[PDB]
């Protein structure tokens, strides 16, 4: 059916077989086969933050039947914002271990690319695959790269970045599920970010990360 891939022989022309889906290389290289867990212990302290994060992502993946009984829509994405060095990367590795699922590494800079109009196709493919891999959590680093939409830009303003910013919303919207893809987002500030992205049905929880407390640093040591 139109849009599906099929092989044809370039020398003389027959459809050999029908070929299954294909995901470009540029997204493929960024991916991970899952790396060892640091868990909650290595990121000592940061207790309140851990409690919010665990409730949002990990418990709906495992005990998903109970969550349907509550009636609730499981998070579109949760957000982590606040100063670096608070162990966000560590915390991500821990999340992954509790759920028993794939953390699909995504870089915000990889999505905007050197080819034009292809860069937009890249965002569609990255979320598209996460569904196919099984239920997934997408760990996106530095979403500040994808775009900040305050546009009125009468002169230029790039707009490889504009296409990707809009496409990212579309995948979060319930044209395709958002109960299957969860987004664990880490960005250093929300000041840089635009409200189109933040909302409360693109990124549901807003978890601030303050710099470690006095007891927290002793645990880290």
């Amino acid at each position: 059916k139109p849009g599906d891939l099929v092989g044809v022989n370039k020398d003389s022309y027959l459809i050999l077989e029908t070929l299954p889906t294909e995901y470009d290389s540029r997204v493929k290289a960024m991916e991970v086969d899952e790396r060892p867990t640091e868990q909650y212990s290595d990121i000592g302290g940061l207790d309140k933050q851990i409690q919010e994060l665990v409730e949002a992502i990990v418990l709906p993946m495992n005990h998903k039947e109970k969550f349907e009984n509550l009636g609730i829509q499981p998070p579109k994405g949760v957000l982590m914002y606040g100063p670096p060095g608070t162990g966000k990367t560590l915390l991500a590795r821990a999340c992954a271990a509790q759920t028993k699922a794939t953390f699909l590494k995504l870089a915000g800079p990889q999505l905007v690319q050197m080819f034009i109009g292809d860069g937009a196709k890249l965002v569609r493919d990255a979320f598209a695959l996460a569904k196919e891999k099984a239920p997934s959590i997408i760990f996106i680093d530095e979403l500040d790269a994808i775009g900040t939409k305050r546009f009125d830009s009468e002169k230029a303003g790039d707009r490889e970045v504009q296409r990707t910013m809009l496409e990212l919303l579309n995948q979060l919207d319930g044209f395709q599920p958002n109960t299957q893809v969860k987004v664990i987002a880490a960005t250093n500030r929300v000041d840089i970010l635009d409200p189109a992205l933040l909302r409360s049905g693109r990124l549901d929880r807003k978890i601030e990360f303050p710099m470690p407390n006095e007891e927290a640093r002793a645990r880290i040591m």
Binding site: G3, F115, G117, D118, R163, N170, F175
Partner: protein, 201 residues
């Protein structure tokens, strides 16, 4: 049963790799001028058997690769993408989940829903129904939820199109998709066409 399938394959190989074209303009009954969907423009013939009358510039023809004679007639040109948009009409979200917006919902119907059933109502007024609808709003409102949600309930032909990746760097390839949806709708009348995130364009 297997032998029947095997037989068509040989037809391609005898013509050596059949190619699609279109009749640009009819020179005379024997000779048509064909512009190719593959590349070069061609002067072509027709089989004795294949009638001239059938071919039209609105539609596509097929050519033997090695002698450039029209073997037969092919149907109207439609993009692969547009077939996927027509299908995408049930994306779920019922009329209940889009409520409270109800005053604004009534306004969308006047424009979209009324001309389908009868253009006659606006005709009595002596006015042609107003062109184009723009949905805009702050984020999270459900401007896209609304357009999508009614399209599923009626289950009318509705093309749902993502236009935030339809532009490519491939010159001439971006043009075709955008044209095709307007043309198509005129054919599959009545129809609604919704483009989402055309902020991009």
């Amino acid at each position: 049963k297997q032998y029947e399938k095997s037989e068509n394959d040989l037809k391609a190989l005898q013509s050596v790799g059949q190619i699609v074209g279109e009749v640009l303009k009819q020179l005379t009954e024997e000779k048509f001028i064909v512009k190719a969907t593959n590349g070069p423009r061609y002067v072509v013939g027709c089989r004795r058997q294949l009638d001239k009358s059938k071919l039209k510039p609105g539609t596509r023809v097929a050519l033997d690769m090695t002698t450039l004679t029209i073997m037969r007639y092919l149907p109207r040109e439609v993009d692969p993408l547009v077939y996927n948009m027509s299908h995408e009409d049930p994306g779920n979200v019922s009329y209940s989940e889009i409520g409270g917006l109800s005053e604004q919902i009534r306004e969308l119907r006047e424009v979209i829903e009324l001309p389908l059933t009868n253009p006659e109502l606006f005709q009595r007024v002596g006015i042609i129904p107003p062109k184009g609808c723009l949905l805009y709003g702050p984020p999270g409102t459900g401007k896209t939820l609304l357009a999508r949600a009614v399209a599923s309930q009626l289950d009318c032909n509705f093309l749902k199109v993502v236009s935030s990746s339809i532009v490519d760097k491939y010159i001439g390839e971006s043009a075709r998709l955008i044209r095709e949806m307007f043309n198509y709708a005129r054919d599959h009348q009545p129809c609604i066409i919704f483009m989402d995130e055309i902020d991009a364009i």
